[PDB]
């Protein structure tokens, strides 16, 4: 494994393994799910804790009046790209006196994370961004990767065991486009109730939801304005 | 350029500069040369073989002036030789700017040796594979200065460098003396160059420059062809 030391080294199979290792670092976060309607974009994550007494590590953080990001992985690189995110938002908010469209912001994110992935002696940013926003042409649900190969989707899910989430999202992607906020959000947390083993779920203690609306500013909720959202559910099957 | 700056030059376990020993070996694998100081002038002479019969003898020059009275040859690799020649050029003109006087040869050898020594300390770079033979007629007494890849320098009455420098040096110890003229210096120099070269030595296989107190002079293939009558 003498080719698996640095970012600079191409493999004899062409797969630079520092990126694969950063991908595996993304795979060890918490589960999270983001999905959009035609008018509302909702991203839902799952919190975890180090012990019983400690509080839960928060995931959904604010960026701007219409942009909010999810996260998975490391937190130092998370806050680094977070600070860059608020800075690049308020720069154009200063200069052009308009809100940024999301696509050019995520292009700037990819161009930011390219340089530590090509030179020597820098790490790829272990980061798990799921970005929800509003330009003039409606909601966008993007995801990133440490390879800076940003995607636009209609529903993604990254983190630990997030593949069953994708299976749930496939059999309801036809139903997603039409509905209003309430059943949309509860479809997102039904993705979350299948990203978990069948005997501990979301008892107002681990979930957070961030909605952006055409008249609604991006807003985070945690357990208590989520207790209205958690009723209106049934049990898991036998 | 990248932030490394680390010297690849490390002492041995014994205490030896392996890259300088190897650079001395790379000097020893080069073309032979000889240079002789003989009371009125200094003679330098090299051994310049074309590989084929195709090559031209008017393009590349071994004997090279540094000022109007200072000659300089080598025994090593031309690609490093031209670089440090150009450095010595630029360096001599700063002295002539400062003092408005032609630089003495000892001061050249001081500064060039300082450059070469300072460059073998410097990081991520190999030493030069070049040994010089610098000469000139400064303040009456002419001089002759050999340097080496290790940064050191000496002062010779007659010496050689290249292939069979040991054999040429044993010829020099027997042949040379204290007092000769420029012609006898050319005679013993072409003799010791004829010690190690191939049988056909013409106006182009050698390339000879002299020094007078009236200034440096680089001889032509005309007088070189004039000289190898009753050769060596």
């Amino acid at each position: 494994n003498q080719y698996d030391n640095d970012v600079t080294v191409w493999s004899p199979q062409g797969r630079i393994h520092q990126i694969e290792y950063a991908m595996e670092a993304v795979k060890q976060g918490s589960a999270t799910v983001g999905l959009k309607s035609k008018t509302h974009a909702v991203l839902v994550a799952l919190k975890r804790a180090q012990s019983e007494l400690a509080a839960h590590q928060k995931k959904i953080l604010h960026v701007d009046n219409h942009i909010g990001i999810s996260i998975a992985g490391l937190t130092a690189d998370a806050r680094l790209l977070c600070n860059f995110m608020r800075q690049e938002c308020l720069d154009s908010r200063f200069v052009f006196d308009r809100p940024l469209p999301v696509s050019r912001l995520v292009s700037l994110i990819g161009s930011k994370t390219q340089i530590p992935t090509q030179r020597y002696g820098r790490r790829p940013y272990g980061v798990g961004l799921l970005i929800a926003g509003y330009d003039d042409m409606g909601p966008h649900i993007f995801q990133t990767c440490p390879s800076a190969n940003y995607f636009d989707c209609r529903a993604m899910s990254i983190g630990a065991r997030s593949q069953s989430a994708r299976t749930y999202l496939e059999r309801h992607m036809s139903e997603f486009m039409e509905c209003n906020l309430n059943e949309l959000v509860k479809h997102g947390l039904r993705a979350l109730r299948e990203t978990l083993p069948a005997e501990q779920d979301l008892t107002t203690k681990n979930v957070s939801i961030g909605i952006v609306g055409k008249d609604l500013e991006f807003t985070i909720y945690d357990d208590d304005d989520v207790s209205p959202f958690l009723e209106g559910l049934e049990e898991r099957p036998q | 350029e990248r932030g490394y700056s680390f010297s690849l030059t490390t002492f041995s376990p014994s205490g030896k500069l392996v890259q300088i020993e190897y650079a001395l070996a790379a000097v020893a694998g080069g073309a032979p040369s000889v240079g002789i100081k003989a009371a009125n002038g200094v003679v330098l002479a090299t051994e310049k073989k074309q590989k084929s019969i195709l090559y031209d003898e008017r393009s590349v020059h071994k004997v090279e002036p540094i000022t109007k009275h200072i000659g300089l040859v080598y025994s090593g690799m031309g690609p490093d030789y031209r670089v440090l020649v150009h450095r010595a050029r630029k360096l001599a003109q700063q002295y002539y700017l400062v003092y408005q006087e032609p630089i003495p040869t000892a001061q050249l050898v001081q500064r060039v040796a300082s450059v070469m020594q300072e460059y073998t300390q410097s990081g991520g770079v190999r030493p030069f594979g070049v040994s010089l033979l610098i000469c000139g007629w400064n303040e009456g007494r002419p001089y002759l200065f050999q340097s080496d890849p290790s940064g050191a320098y000496f002062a010779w009455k007659a010496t050689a460098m290249g292939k069979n420098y040991v054999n040429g040096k044993t010829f020099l110890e027997k042949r040379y003396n204290e007092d000769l003229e420029l012609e006898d210096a050319i005679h013993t120099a072409i003799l010791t160059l004829k010690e190690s070269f191939e049988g056909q030595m013409t106006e182009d296989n050698i390339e000879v420059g002299i020094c007078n107190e009236a200034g440096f002079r680089r001889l032509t293939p005309t007088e070189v062809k004039d000289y190898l009558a009753a050769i060596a």
């Binding site: 604010h62 960026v63 608020r86 308020l90 908010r93 200063f94 006196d97 | -």
Partner: protein, 213 residues
């Protein structure tokens, strides 16, 4: 030669009440002996409880407003809460001193509520001092307005005149009267008077015209 400054003028008033902070300002933006417009409100709504007014050189007013809004958003995205009034005052003093050796030609008045729910007006100078006063009038018509507020609000220089707390609609007729009376003699007082009222329930605005001279 090229002169880097110009006097656009304007008149900003503030009155700190028991539970309200009224900030009003004319909307004429002029230059020399001309009129550029008759609608340009000097007031700016920073938070739900803070309104700032900026008169003087107009470009520095716009720049300063945008920088203050940016740093407000920075404080919000760092500390999960909006700034107070005195925090904005300290930050603005640091900003106004941070271009000391090429100064802003800007008078500044911040009105708003404190955290106890009381009125607080923080005045300023172009170079960066500030103080917590009950009422200030900044801009060209400052000298036409300060002694009258000393007479009515401050109750100064009178005898056997008791101290009544300043109510709301009394302050409103005060603001309307002082802008009419100052617009009679001033050349920079606008037409549109933009009155901003900060209560414990939000921000109210009100537009009252004047003589169109």
């Amino acid at each position: 030669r090229f002169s880097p400054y110009v006097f656009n003028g304007g008149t900003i008033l503030a009155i700190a009440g028991e539970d309200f902070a009224i900030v009003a300002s004319d909307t004429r933006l002029s230059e020399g002996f001309s009129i550029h417009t008759r609608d340009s409100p000097k007031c700016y709504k920073l938070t739900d409880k803070t309104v700032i007014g900026c008169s003087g050189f107009h470009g520095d007013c716009l720049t300063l407003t945008k920088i203050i809004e940016a740093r407000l958003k920075m404080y919000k995205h760092s500390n999960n809460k909006a700034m107070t009034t005195g925090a904005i005052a300290a930050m603005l003093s640091t900003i106004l001193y941070s271009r000391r050796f090429f100064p802003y030609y800007v008078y500044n008045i911040i009105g708003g509520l404190d955290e106890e729910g009381k009125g607080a007006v923080y005045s300023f100078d172009p170079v960066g001092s500030y103080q917590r006063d009950s009422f200030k009038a900044g801009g060209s018509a400052s000298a036409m307005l300060q002694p009258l507020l000393d007479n009515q609000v401050g109750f100064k220089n009178m005898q056997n005149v008791e101290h009544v707390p300043l109510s709301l609609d009394r302050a409103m007729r005060l603001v309307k009267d002082v802008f009419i009376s100052a617009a009679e003699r001033d050349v920079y007082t606008g037409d549109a008077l933009r009155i901003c009222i900060v209560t414990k329930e939000g921000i109210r605005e009100e537009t009252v015209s004047l003589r169109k001279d």
